[PDB]
Design a protein around this ligand. Structure first.
Ligand SMILES: Nc1ncnc2c1ncn2[C@@H]1O[C@H](COP(=O)(O)OP(=O)(O)OP(=O)(O)O)[C@@H](O)[C@H]1O
Ligand SMILES: Nc1ncnc2c1ncn2[C@@H]1O[C@H](COP(=O)(O)OP(=O)(O)OP(=O)(O)O)[C@@H](O)[C@H]1O
Ligand SMILES: Nc1nc2c(ncn2[C@@H]2O[C@H](COP(=O)(O)OP(=O)(O)O)[C@@H](O)[C@H]2O)c(=O)[nH]1
Ligand SMILES: Nc1nc2c(ncn2[C@@H]2O[C@H](COP(=O)(O)OP(=O)(O)O)[C@@H](O)[C@H]2O)c(=O)[nH]1
Lengths: 448, 447, 87, 54, 101
């Protein structure tokens, strides 16, 4: 249907013309429709968070202490996005949150939580309540690689009235457990787990010591969240924020040990000698690590930070202080330059509805950062409270689960792409640069 | 500490004086503090929904189609209250909702959901998704009393890609099942179930046919909700609303079969010959059923409906030229009804914990929640996003009704502590006795 | 009776309390009859309110909001919208 | 009449610090340098649509 | 750091272009960021009040009778600025205020 989709009349305004004048906000323009020959469910919305990380869902949770901690990052990664753990915390806390995200989903669980036989049931209940993991292994001396003695699961202790009793009293004993011997392929081990109708399958050496552990919950998560953002080992992707001071070097090291996939630099004005040196140092010291630099709003800043070695750029400044830039113009200009140099960009700021996210992605951003839009969801940090007959969080109003909100944004982006007439947002960006996706500036009156 | 708690100076206004001049709303008055020698957690807030039903939580979900269906009634009963299933539906739908509430929690499950061996896995998945019950029994001919062939649980089907396969392929088969033989006491059966580490325990006769079923989920629910409102058989209490037309008689019959514990009459003005006749007929035909009559706002209406045989009264009215301010209505009707041994339900104008506390204190035994619980997850309707708000269909999301009920509970406890009495029964009695006192507030003092 | 040398008057979780002028009058009259002075604590927002509270029986008045934001209060000053507020 | 803003000394210091911070973000270490580079076209601006002013 | 500070792409609008159209207020435009290699405490804000007077603080108190008298002019000068004594007064009063400063 190329004859029907390709515009020859081209009745509309190209992005280049639209942004060649005063600085624009998202409400200043609208995107013209194209040609439709597909259902909205078939639209691909993925974008590059960084040079090497593609996100099925082009959404990133902002690294504000009111938005992103372990739970939010987990939720984002599960739906195909990613979260950035905030840095308003110590190195140890941030590393722990990163670990919580990374070790939530696994194939072979390599350091299974394990206890000694004499530990009270209270300890297992506390483990489940705090860290949310069942299937605790009982081993020699409590070592995660010790001799396997038994396993404790939900139904093993849910009826015990004396919480101080040792787990050995109620654990399922090793002699009665289905297990496997190292080595085994993950596919075979998980098939054995499915057939066994049990929740866990330890993998042991010839000395019956614990090598690793498979969890049925991982298979169920894979089924219920088929688009999860995953690294090579089957863990969820996780990102973390840091400033560019010399102290933060230590932080980065800790984060690298915690297993972050992306480091995100935290600065209102990232075109600094400190940030350039920091990017150089990180790329030298942790080559496996990808760096998101910023924030920037102009191509000159982008040039300096890409020269330093940035793998992506956060765009936004102002989204009093007399320095900044209208966000739609900033996104278009910086994204166009960075893309010309092979670097994707993240829209950070002023994204307050689905239409704004769609426009930001269309005019050049590969992914979008969500702050206010997801504040107040269940997965954000903070405690709920009732006030004036309202369920606020400490304040913002409750928006429910972020999973449903992410799905809603996904469907809206798909529908917008359909109306625009392209089956992917990569195609939309390309055709925008090509002049086949067209716009109209809107008079102030037309904005009502 | 009677010398310190008993008021002799009595610096304040008694309820009888407070309500003796003009119709009052809840904002027109405040309750004066008393003496405290206990922590708020020790406060008993229970009230009588009806002559024979005591509720640990004096809260009742209103029978509006936007508030109370099976899920809401389940939540209310679990937290120690009760729900009234609306009647804006057919007799069959209302009976099904009641049955859903009554059979959610059990001891021995008498009619366990069962399927034949050839049923597709998709059907069991549909059962779990719609009705939320696992541990489906597979028996000869799919009858709940048929010969037991196997059982299907979460882990038996969570991995199968072909949903059209018969359950016989993946079920846990009878020869490998832990079971028990009729007859058995519930305590022993549940202990055996716990020791077995399984989720279900069928109970069969000597012919291996299914007699009943024990579920571990019942024990866990009992553990997590120790104050649930329960009948003699361990089911949750459930109430249902009905009009007083002759047709509605059929409705009542259906509801009685579904097992409602309380019938709630639906009328803006319940002092009618139709409602009087209806109450007489219900008490004659279904003596086990308790009836909440109303709505009424005056003692004359209350007299007629209590004479008819009502077990409780709904208070509240306010087409526009007839009604009564709700605080006065509650005080007057509750005082008369209590003098005749009948409890009352405050229905209307309860918009915060202070209003509920005042309504209970001035004579209401329990309070009906409408707007206050609209928009909670358990209400009927689907959620939708609009302007980044997550409304439900025209109300804002309030989260789980369970957390809200706990919040209301704690607020009532704190109010009672400030008043200086350890139960709301004591508060009401001392109100009638003149030991719990009030102050009317000038319009300016209300800011 | 316990041995208090003075009383703080004021209340007004939401369903229990009392309008403050009545509270001051009643409590102050009783306490004075027993030789005990009283402190008006709450709802004093201007000089007229303080005068009335003292006149109807309070011996002294407690100042909260009325003196919040003075230089001597705890907290650091900051400029916002050209106003010089304190946190 | 106008509302009390306290000492003008503290206000002057506040303005000083703000001007310094703005100059830093602009990327020049003096306002003479800022003016010169403005005339030279090395300090750049963006006109803001009426909508962008919210 | 001249290679990093000097803009060659020049992604932005010069003052000359910005002011070549309708008359603008301060809210009509924003200043784009550049390159940072110094701490804010090192920034010099001085400007010339006149051909021969350099002010460490480029601030001048307006000569309105509600703003500047001896005390305000003293405060401005002490902080590195200057004040302008208003003229809604007699010669003698204005001279006395000047002497006080
Ligand atoms: N591989 C295994 N071999 C033998 N027994 C096992 C094995 N895995 C689990 N069990 C036992 O089976 C029973 C599982 O009950 P339970 O429902 O609590 O586990 P689960 O549902 O798989 O995970 P959860 O702890 O989250 O409930 C327990 O007695 C447990 O000790
Ligand atoms: N009384 C029993 N005796 C033997 N096996 C049983 C019995 N009841 C259930 N099973 C089987 O044991 C395993 C239980 O797995 P599952 O984790 O799904 O149980 P459950 O969590 O208690 O039930 P559900 O989660 O579906 O409500 C299944 O294979 C099930 O068919
Ligand atoms: N027994 C068990 N362990 C798990 C499970 N899921 C993840 N784990 C592992 O349990 C470990 C938790 O480590 P933890 O003690 O909480 O980290 P700490 O904060 O340093 O003490 C991690 O090595 C996880 O990989 C599970 O389902 N069962
Ligand atoms: N197998 C099983 N059955 C249950 C459980 N809990 C309740 N039930 C029974 O499941 C039955 C469901 O009734 P149903 O035939 O579906 O009524 P319908 O909705 O009108 O079709 C009820 O009779 C309950 O008693 C459970 O945990 N497991």
């Amino acid at each position: 249907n190329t004859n029907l989709r390709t515009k020859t009349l081209r009745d509309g305004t190209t992005a280049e013309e639209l942004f060649s004048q005063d600085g624009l906000s998202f409400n200043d323009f609208i995107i013209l429709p194209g040609f439709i020959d597909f259902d909205s469910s078939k639209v691909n919305v993925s974008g590059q968070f960084t040079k090497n990380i593609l996100l099925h869902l082009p959404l990133v949770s902002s690294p504000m202490d009111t938005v992103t901690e372990s739970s939010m990052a987990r939720a984002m990664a599960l739906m195909g996005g990613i979260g950035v753990i905030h840095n308003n915390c110590t190195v140890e806390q941030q590393a722990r949150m990163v670990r919580s995200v990374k070790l939530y989903r696994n194939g072979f669980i390599m350091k299974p939580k394990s206890v000694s036989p004499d530990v009270p049931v209270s300890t297992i209940r506390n483990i489940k309540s705090e860290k949310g993991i069942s299937g605790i292994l009982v081993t020699e001396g409590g070592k995660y690689d010790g001799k396997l003695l038994g396993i404790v699961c939900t139904k093993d202790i849910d009826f015990v009235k004396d919480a101080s009793a040792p787990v050995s009293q109620y654990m399922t004993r090793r002699e009665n457990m289905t297990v496997e011997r190292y080595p085994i392929k993950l596919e075979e081990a998980m098939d054995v787990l499915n057939r066994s109708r049990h929740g866990y399958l330890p993998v042991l050496n010839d000395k019956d010591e614990v090598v690793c552990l498979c969890s049925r919950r991982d298979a169920v998560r894979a089924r219920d969240y088929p688009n999860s953002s995953l690294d090579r080992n089957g863990h969820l992707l996780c990102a973390a924020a840091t400033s560019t001071r010399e102290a933060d070097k230590g932080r980065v090291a800790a984060l690298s040990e915690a297993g972050i996939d992306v480091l995100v630099l935290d600065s209102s004005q990232g075109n600094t000698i400190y940030q350039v040196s920091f990017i150089r140092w990180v790329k030298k010291t942790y080559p496996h690590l990808e760096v998101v630099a910023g924030n920037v709003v102009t191509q000159d800043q982008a040039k300096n930070l890409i020269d330093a070695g940035a793998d992506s750029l956060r765009i936004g400044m102002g989204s009093v202080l007399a320095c900044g830039r209208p966000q739609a113009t900033a996104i278009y200009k910086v994204a166009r330059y960075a893309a010309s140099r092979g670097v994707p960009c993240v829209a950070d700021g002023g994204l307050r509805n689905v239409g704004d996210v769609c426009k930001a992605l269309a005019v050049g951003a590969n992914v979008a950062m969500l702050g206010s839009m997801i504040a107040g969801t269940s997965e954000t940090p903070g405690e709920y409270f009732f006030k004036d007959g309202m369920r606020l969080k400490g304040a913002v109003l409750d928006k429910g689960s972020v999973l449903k909100l992410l799905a809603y944004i996904h469907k809206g982006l798909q529908q917008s792409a359909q109306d625009i007439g392209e089956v992917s947002f990569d195609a939309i960006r390309e055709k925008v640069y090509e002049g086949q996706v067209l716009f109209n500036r809107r008079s102030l009156t037309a904005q009502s």
